[PDB]
Amino acid sequence: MKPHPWFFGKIPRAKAEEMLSKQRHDGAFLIRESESAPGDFSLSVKFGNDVQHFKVLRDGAGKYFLWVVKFNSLNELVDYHRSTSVSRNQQIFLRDIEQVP
Ligand SMILES: CNC(=O)[C@H]1[C@H](C(=O)N[C@H](C(=O)N[C@@H](CC(N)=O)C(N)=O)C(C)C)[C@H]1c1ccc(OP(=O)(O)O)cc1
């Protein structure tokens, strides 16, 4: 197995922006522990010359979600959005960031 190159843990929202703005592919993303919602997570995605942010929401059942579809894990939420757009207004598919070993 191998660890997921998308979990950055505790990193400021603005830092996620600086990092993702340097990626070249739209969809480059990362999950970070929320700064406005301590104890939760946020998803930051590169799209054009901007970095969009999404709240990773939770329900009383412990599920994770962005919109209506609910997932049992962060991993499944992430993977689902590699083939279905994370945005309703735009077609944005998640793709791992390019990192040099
Ligand atoms: C300045 N405020 C924002 O960044 C708006 C961001 C937002 O609304 N994003 C759009 C959106 O419509 N999000 C939906 C879906 C979602 N799950 O975020 C929503 N607001 O419920 C998205 C299409 C770019 C919502 C946001 C606010 C905080 C946040 O966590 P954090 O950055 O850690 O403080 C993550 C996202």
UniProtKB/Swiss-Prot annotation:
Keywords: Acetylation, Cytoplasm, Endosome, Golgi apparatus, Host-virus interaction, Isopeptide bond, Nucleus, Phosphoprotein, Repeat, SH2 domain, SH3 domain, Ubl conjugation
Effect of V69P: Strong loss of clustering of phospho-LAT at the T-cell plasma membrane
Modification N6-acetyllysine occurs at: K55
GO molecular function, a single term: epidermal growth factor receptor binding
Post-translational modifications reported in the UniProt record: Ubiquitinated by RNF173, leading to proteasomal degradation and inhibition of the RAF/MEK/ERK pathway. In the nucleus, polyubiquitinated by RBBP6 at Lys-55 at DNA damage sites.
Biological processes per GO annotation: actin cytoskeleton organization; B cell receptor signaling pathway; branching involved in labyrinthine layer morphogenesis; cellular response to ionizing radiation; endodermal cell differentiation; epidermal growth factor receptor signaling pathway; fibroblast growth factor receptor signaling pathway; insulin receptor signaling pathway
Effect on the protein upon substituting K55R: Loss of polyubiquitination
Entry's free-text remark on domains: The SH3 domains mediate interaction with RALGPS1 and SHB.
Homology family: Belongs to the GRB2/sem-5/DRK family.
Designated name of the protein: Growth factor receptor-bound protein 2
Species name: Homo sapiens
Shown part of the complete sequence: 55 to 155 of 217
